[PDB]
Design a protein around this ligand. Sequence first.
Ligand SMILES: O=c1ccn([C@@H]2O[C@H](COP(=O)(O)OP(=O)(O)O)[C@@H](O)[C@H]2O)c(=O)[nH]1
Ligand SMILES: O=c1ccn([C@@H]2O[C@H](COP(=O)(O)OP(=O)(O)O)[C@@H](O)[C@H]2O)c(=O)[nH]1
Ligand SMILES: Nc1nc(=O)n([C@H]2C[C@H](O)[C@@H](CO)O2)cc1Br
Ligand SMILES: Nc1nc(=O)n([C@H]2C[C@H](O)[C@@H](CO)O2)cc1Br
Lengths: 236, 234
Amino acid sequence: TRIKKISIEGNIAAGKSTFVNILKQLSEDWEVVPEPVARWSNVQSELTMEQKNGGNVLQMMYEKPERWSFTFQTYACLSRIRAQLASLNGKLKDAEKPVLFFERSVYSDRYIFASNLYESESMNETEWTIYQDWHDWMNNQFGQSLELDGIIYLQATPETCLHRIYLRGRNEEQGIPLEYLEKLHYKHESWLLHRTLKTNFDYLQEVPILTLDVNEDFKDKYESLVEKVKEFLSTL
Amino acid sequence: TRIKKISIEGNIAAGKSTFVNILKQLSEDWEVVPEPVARWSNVQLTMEQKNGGNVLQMMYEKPERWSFTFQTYACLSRIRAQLASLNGKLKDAEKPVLFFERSVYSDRYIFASNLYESESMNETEWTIYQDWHDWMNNQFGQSLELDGIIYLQATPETCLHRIYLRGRNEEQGIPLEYLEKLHYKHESWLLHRTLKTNFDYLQEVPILTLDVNEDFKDKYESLVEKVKEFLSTL
Ligand SMILES: O=c1ccn([C@@H]2O[C@H](COP(=O)(O)OP(=O)(O)O)[C@@H](O)[C@H]2O)c(=O)[nH]1
Ligand SMILES: O=c1ccn([C@@H]2O[C@H](COP(=O)(O)OP(=O)(O)O)[C@@H](O)[C@H]2O)c(=O)[nH]1
Ligand SMILES: Nc1nc(=O)n([C@H]2C[C@H](O)[C@@H](CO)O2)cc1Br
Ligand SMILES: Nc1nc(=O)n([C@H]2C[C@H](O)[C@@H](CO)O2)cc1Br
């Protein structure tokens, strides 16, 4: 596909949806696929069978993670794979220099969230190794159109995020302690900064990573961030 | 797709594997795909084998907890078993037929549906499972789609005895009642054809019913004759 594919990765409330809502408008050639679990959260302040399903298991994961982590992760990834295909197959067709920016990836579902829940014992060996087998298979069967051209890592401190959950307003999330935000932080850092983490995805070894410090608020001062995105994107 | 795909359907211990192993022996153009979960029973470690054994045991031990997880893995493991057979087997055959031991419709419309009606999957699990199943078999289900179905009809009392003959520890506690629920879903789907389903083609798929209440391991010729006759109609 002539479409280049870049994932925007970062801790809970790093500012990914913000950044991507900024990039979409800066080129008719730039397009966005939001995270489907991003839409499962907010209140009944909308219809949808995926969202009712997502609404339900998300909330169920908050109340009993060790009962619902596998079902959640399973469905979150399905939902992401489906939605990524639809944008690939739907958007950017008349674009000269098309860039599709993914709000996270199949790989954050696995090596961030799913890996953490297992290590946090909310998944047993069986649940985790089934999910990993299911994830290898789901992604080597469909997800082949989705292999990433590069990755943008929005790096913020666990403490910035806490504040941005602070500043965001979602009830469920106000109860995420720093220690959990800290855990995902370390895992992003080992996956993306150090590039220690091996993945069962060979080409990942060689995908370009762009790391951007997002601690400073970028709503009214994003031009240098985008300048680095634009340069990153030319090497691709 | 010149390989004809036929599923063999029926209850636990009706005689599905026996009949499948009989069939395979009779022709060079005939190949079988044995059902995954059947292999997850025995010790007698592959990753699948390992997760599989574990999750069946957990399933037995607590079905309200483990049913969704079991049903996704079963079905996933079955799709990949059938996909591998189809791109592997019967390349030189002149009249190729691959017989599936069960299928993804029985995964969903007998077993998963039965667990839903048993309160072993709550509503969102059943809904999520249906969504995942629909998506894939509308993505991939393609080259797996069936040419016909062969239904091995046994009474629940026949299966109970056969379960006991087959001597799997696990299965010894399967009550007639559960067998009788499974029986009704088969009669329902495969004989009376009243069951409704998200795969429209299955409405016009031909079905051969075979009564396997009699032992056939040494007296199967009439069973096989009906199969050949069926195969020529498709
Ligand atoms: O530079 C920034 C980045 C984000 N935010 C705010 O921080 C919260 C979390 O951002 P976002 O919704 O983008 O979170 P993410 O998508 O990463 O989870 C939101 O209320 C944003 O308005 C902000 O004020 N300045
Ligand atoms: O005509 C038959 C068919 C089956 N069996 C036995 O009944 C048990 C159940 O058969 P099978 O495993 O093939 O049933 P499936 O579970 O595959 O439907 C096994 O011990 C078979 O050897 C039998 O005695 N006579
Ligand atoms: N694959 C995923 N697993 C999760 O547990 N979350 C959680 C973290 C956070 O509480 C919320 C994201 O809005 O869901 C998200 C994704 Br994406
Ligand atoms: N899709 C399935 N779901 C099940 O619960 N089983 C059960 C039937 C029996 O109780 C045990 C051994 O096959 O697993 C089988 C299949 Br196939």
